[PDB]
Amino acid sequence: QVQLVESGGGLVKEETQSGLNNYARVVEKGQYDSLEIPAQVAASWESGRDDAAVFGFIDKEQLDKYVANGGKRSDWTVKFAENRSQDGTLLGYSLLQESVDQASYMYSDNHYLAEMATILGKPEEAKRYRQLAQQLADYINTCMFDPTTQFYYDVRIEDKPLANGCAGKPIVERGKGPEGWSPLFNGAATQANADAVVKVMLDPKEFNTFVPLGTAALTNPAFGADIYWRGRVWVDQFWFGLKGMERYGYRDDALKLADTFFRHAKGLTADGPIQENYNPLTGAQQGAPNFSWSAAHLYMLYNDFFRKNADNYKNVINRTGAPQYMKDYDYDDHQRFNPFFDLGAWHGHLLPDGPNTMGGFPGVALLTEEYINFMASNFDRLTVWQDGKKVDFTLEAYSIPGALVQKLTAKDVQVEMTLRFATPRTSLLETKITSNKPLDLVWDGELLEKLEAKEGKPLSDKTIAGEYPDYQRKISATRDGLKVTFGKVRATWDLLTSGESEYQVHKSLPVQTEINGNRFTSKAHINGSTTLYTTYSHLLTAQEVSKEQMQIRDILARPAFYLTASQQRWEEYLKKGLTNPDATPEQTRVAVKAIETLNGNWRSPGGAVKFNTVTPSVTGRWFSGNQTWPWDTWKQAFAMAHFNPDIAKENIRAVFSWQIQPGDSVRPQDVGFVPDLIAWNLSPERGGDGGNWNERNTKPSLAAWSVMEVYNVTQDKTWVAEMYPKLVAYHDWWLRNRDHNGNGVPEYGATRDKAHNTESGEMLFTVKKSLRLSCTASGAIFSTYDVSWYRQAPEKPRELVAIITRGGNTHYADTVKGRFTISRDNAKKTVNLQMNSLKPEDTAVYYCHAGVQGAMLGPRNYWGQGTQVTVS
Amino acid sequence: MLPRWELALYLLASLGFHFYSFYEVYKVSREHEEELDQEFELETDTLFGGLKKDATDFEWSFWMEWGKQWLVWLLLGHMVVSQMATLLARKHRPWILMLYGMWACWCVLGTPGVAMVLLHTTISFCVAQFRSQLLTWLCSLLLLSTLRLQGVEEVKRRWYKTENEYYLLQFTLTVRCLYYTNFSLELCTSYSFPWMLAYVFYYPVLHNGPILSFSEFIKQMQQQEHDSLKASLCVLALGLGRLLCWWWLAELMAHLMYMHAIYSSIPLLETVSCWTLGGLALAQVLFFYVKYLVLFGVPALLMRLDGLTPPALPRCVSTMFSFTGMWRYFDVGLHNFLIRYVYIPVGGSQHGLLGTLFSTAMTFAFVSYWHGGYDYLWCWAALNWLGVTVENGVRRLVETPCIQDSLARYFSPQARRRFHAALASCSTSMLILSNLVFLGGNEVGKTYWNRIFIQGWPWVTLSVLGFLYCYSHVGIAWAQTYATD
Ligand SMILES: CCCCCCCCCCCCCCCCSCCNC(=O)CCNC(=O)[C@H](O)C(C)(C)COP(=O)(O)OP(=O)(O)OC[C@H]1O[C@@H](n2cnc3c(N)ncnc32)[C@H](O)[C@@H]1OP(=O)(O)O
Ligand code: HEM
Ligand SMILES: CC(C)CCC[C@@H](C)[C@H]1CC[C@H]2[C@@H]3CC=C4C[C@@H](O)CC[C@]4(C)[C@H]3CC[C@]12C
Ligand SMILES: CCCCCCCCCCCCCCCC(=O)O
Ligand SMILES: CCCCCCCCCCCCCCCC(=O)O
Ligand SMILES: [Mg+2]
């Protein structure tokens, strides 16, 4: 009887060791699936391009072809070093590689600091900064430029510097990337090198693709379309390329490329949200829906290179929807609707997408402390009854910059509902009903019950109450309007509540409310045409509730004042922002879309962040709340300065408010360091329970650039005076903790964090081991069987993993191709599955299968008992 | 239609390549006797000198072992009981044979086997009481699918000490599927539960037996006229002589050639000569033909002694030149079952081209599912459906008055026959390839396709097609005897 016995399976857990010397020793010792330094991961994050080719990120198939064409596999390994002060204290870590983009950013920072010092009457500091910039530009043009290839590259920090004083030769092997024209953007490049770079990046074989100026040239060994940082076009690198081209006398070519981008970038003229990047060949979009960074650089393109009243721009972004899940995600886990946020508020609204949601603004997207979650599908939905019969309405719902409008028209009753934001926590709704007869108004609402879905298809049957039992939503009637209270939930990755959060609905009319569990119903009677005002307020703390009670009482006293204030504010937004006279209406609409996206991604002060701030995306999975990054903030403040200087200033202030000051408790050595991520909740090391707060690294320095842009727009010397010491401290930190050589050229790296090293100061690294399942067959003619490996992940059907036929032909599932290798030994009558690069998705019960193929061999079909494989 | 000398030449060439390719396969088997024995454990016996048998064919060895052990005795017992019932109680013979069938099923498969057969029969009967073809077919397909469920398979395997008993139960239930499906579909007295049990528990066809139509079974079990005892003994003697001859031929083929072991070792099959490949294909198809000749001549002989008319035995595969003839004359019982209950209910070939394609697709899909539903079976089904469809299309196209008149005007009858043989050559090549996919799976099909049609397009393919052209001339000449009527 044929019997199959599985073996070799188990729980694979990465073991974490310590010591830089041990890491080198382990590498020499070999025999490991993969080594992984958390500090090097943070270093890759600090570059702002987590999988760029220049930093040694190349796919296995690309690397194999690279070696086959002639090239060592070590050409793509970036050595890692730790920066230790003279005393021996660990300042941090840095890649043994000096980035051309980082050097150019430091150069631009040096001239902007010099300009600020000149403004502040500090000639000596300005002269010193100009000298530093000059020497840095000399270094960039002497070391990071390859005359043979005529392009700018990164330089390895080799064991010994070159004769000219440069740290290693340019890394030409890893191909060309957007960092090659960073010197052009920052002005470090010479005229000859600028011409060479422009020639390279105007070549259709290198960068002049369907969507030009991608994150990797077509000739890059690691280039791949649909790879975020190895070919996909990001609007910011595109704008940097155009700006450098213009800076070096190639404005006509820059305009041509801008026109090509406008014509070829997908969905640019549609009413969809502004995503992150584009495919260089097809032009397809990808990324978080409402991306402040792409929106900012699209506005910059409009103001610089696109050439050819809020009521004039209706439905610039599709804000209609009717969410049925607290997490109504798209294919990339971002909310698939675009709620209307304004004035820094922490709740958003959607337009009615049909008769079901007609009469109210269905979506109520509460911005929990760091995430966006839908509270209801219908809430405060008006329904009109005349003479006891429901009035049938025709819906006309549209969004203008700063307001949501829906007009309901019937034979005798007409309702116009304008939704604007009144305060940083309250949204004011104006419902004016025109009728000749008394009406019975009825408002009804629901609370969502289903938890999550993707593209409208529910992921599971989980409910909000089931997933978050402490999230005890309770609708409570109030003397005026309504209120919803929430329990304390500390789901660090999905939902955060303080137990004092509320969603208060206040109405100008007196209504009779009835609550039935998770739904309510308010009834009112009017003798004719009247205007009623409803304020929706999401309050995240008891202090906020107490403070906003007075604000709400004031709003309903002068609702017209707040409505006209919002209308005017958006009038100045459009007047300042839209200053391009020779732009077609489509380009102006793109600019308005960018302005709306930027203003919607703006948050009021909250939690640890005590300053008004702008996040990468209000609807993003990991960008919502008040999660602020410095890299995104620089560009957001650069763009918003032209139509919202106050908010750009507030965003920069928010970023620099948590700049490490001397005498710090967690990292006293990182004085001037700007945390990579600041959010509502502090990290556990700082007393909070956030989990998003990142101090493992910073991002590339472009602060002086945006600060100077804000000064130029506002011409405010006090702003420069305030921001100069902070920029100087941040620059000094870059020179201290990110310069291994000491040559004044910084390298990307990571700080001295608990995720990088032990308390003693030994660098941590996780050694990952592979798994090799086995399957021995007894009592069979093993040479005639098509042995195979199946896996049945929990709550999923068993799926083929690999199969090797009796003729030796081997097939793998698309999800395990390359990672898994199946072999058979007819002599030992065994089948082995060599599993490498295991990931949590590989956790399942793996079943060996033996089956003949062909009528001559009979109905031989045998299954193994199964073995459990668990990882992470 | 052709000169006698020319047809004699074609027959000589056909026998020539048959026997020469067999000789080449024998030589290759002798070369790799040690390797194959180490890898596939060739059996040793004294039947043919010191030659070693190739027991890699599952069906042949399985049924031979079962016949040695139990099935031959049970078949002889059925024969004796049928004769005794005819002599003593003719009017009750159907019920005596039903009782004997149930007892033999109990003897080989124990209580669980009889219980499972009865359960399937009763479920099919109850569903058939709703006189709907769709419901009956759905019930039959669900019962057939239950045989392939892992949990059901584990429960069944727990019943029997050995795996051979479980495989016997599986085969018995697979054939019972066709039998009670036939009864239920005909049902839409003379169709009562006792008659269904008699039909199902008819031992000669209990395990692996060809589908015998219920109409003929009931008609010929109620005849009341029988042949004398001496005539029965004469028929038994001739049938046993032919059966022993066929069994000896199959054993000789398994001894001289190791086609099954060679097909199992794809690496070997990929390095043998082209003549060895052709001989291996011929030997495989002819061994399958002789195997089912033996496996249906025992049931056929028993039915003939019982006074029934069994479905005609398969015709020599070395006389088949087309998909249509191959599937009309190889498995006549299953072909008739498919014609009556699958092909025609879905329009057959009387609803235009698309209807014919759909009917052929349904028939071949059902056949592949019945055989196991494996990927290679589905591939075989696709290839044979395509072949039958193309043959029907070409036949209709030629049958058009315009095409027929043009052919008569332009080409002499000898030229027309030569063109027919040329087309039948390609038809036969594709038929052989599809049936090799069936017998040896997808690896064998890929090997043959690459080594005959891709890697040997210039001359290997043309040589194969010329030999098959001579073969098809000889096959059509013979088919004139029976295919006309
Ligand atoms: C050198 C070696 C060469 C040999 C190489 C090959 C050898 C291989 C050996 C090993 C092979 C391995 C074993 C095979 C593995 C499977 S085991 C055997 C199982 N058999 C099958 O799967 C065959 C399935 N296919 C068929 O049976 C037929 O091809 C079908 C049923 C699909 C078509 O039947 P047909 O007869 O060929 O086509 P017809 O349209 O002409 O139907 C015949 C009759 O149905 C009648 N019909 C058709 N539609 C209607 C209507 N709607 N109503 C009334 N009647 C109607 C029609 O009038 C006609 O009447 P007839 O002329 O008197 O006969
Ligand atoms: C091209 C060469 C061959 C031709 C033309 C041919 C033709 C025939 C014919 C006309 C019959 C009788 C009618 C029928 O049942 O189909 C037959 C029967 C048979 N042939 Fe062949 N055959 C050839 C090669 C072979 C080979 C190589 C074998 C080896 C197994 C073989 C084995 C048989 C058997 C076992 C029968 C059944 C005889 C009986 O009991 O009636 N034939 N063949
Ligand atoms: C469907 C199944 C039951 C078919 C069985 C076919 C019968 C006829 C087969 C099965 C096994 C065969 C026997 C196997 C071995 C031998 C020994 C040999 O020295 C003489 C022939 C003899 C005695 C065979 C006679 C025929 C035989 C009994
Ligand atoms: C896939 C169909 C194959 C069927 C082959 C049937 C037997 C015909 C004889 C073929 C012999 C080999 C042909 C000559 C080889 C050569 O020229 O080397
Ligand atoms: C695998 C698909 C292709 C196989 C089928 C090819 C069939 C070709 C035609 C066969 C001959 C049909 C009858 C011809 C009659 C004549 O011309 O005399
Ligand atoms: Mg027929």
Numbering used by the authors:
A (entry chain B): 24 to 331, 350 to 913
B (entry chain A): 1 to 188, 197 to 493
Recite the paper's sentences.
HH acyltransferase (HHAT) catalyzes the irreversible transfer of a palmitoyl group from palmitoyl-coenzyme A (Palm-CoA) to SHH-Cys24 (Buglino and Resh, 2008; Chamoun et al., 2001), which is the rate-limiting step in HH ligand production. HHAT is composed of 12-TM helices with both termini located on the cytosolic side of the ER membrane. The 8-TM helix core of HHAT resembles that of the other MBOAT superfamily members (colored blue).
We determined HHAT in complex with a non-hydrolyzable Palm-CoA analog (nhPalm-CoA) lacking the thioester carbonyl, which is bound within the HHAT core domain. The CoA adenine ring protrudes into the solvent at the cytosolic site, stacking between Ile352 and Gln358, and the N1 and N6 nitrogen atoms form hydrogen bonds with the amide nitrogen of Ser357 and the carbonyl oxygen of Gly355, respectively. The CoA phosphate groups are coordinated by a metal ion, built as a magnesium ion based on coordination geometry, and several hydrogen bonds mediated by Arg336 and Ser357. The Palm-CoA moiety is shifted along the membrane normal in the HHAT binding site compared to its average simulated position in a membrane bilayer (Stix et al., 2020). This locates the Palm-CoA thioester in the core of the HHAT cavity close to the proposed reaction center residues His379 and Asp339 that have previously been shown to be important for the catalysis of palmitoyl transfer to SHH. The tail of the nhPalm-CoA 16:0 chain inserts into a binding pocket formed by rearrangement of the HHAT N- and C-terminal helices. The palmitoyl moiety forms mainly hydrophobic interactions with residues located in the HHAT core; however, we also observe additional kinked lipid density that forms part of the palmitoyl substrate binding site, modeled as an additional palmitate moiety. This arrangement of the termini restricts the acyl chain length to a maximum of 16 carbons and provides a rationale for previous analyses of SHH expression revealing acylation of the SHH N terminus predominantly by shorter acyl chains (e.g., myristate, myristoleate), in addition to palmitate, and to a far lesser extent by longer lipids (Long et al., 2015; Pepinsky et al., 1998). Our structure reveals a distinct luminal cavity arrowing toward the catalytic His379 in the reaction center, where the major HHAT interaction loop of MB177 (CDR3 loop) is located, suggesting an access path for SHH.
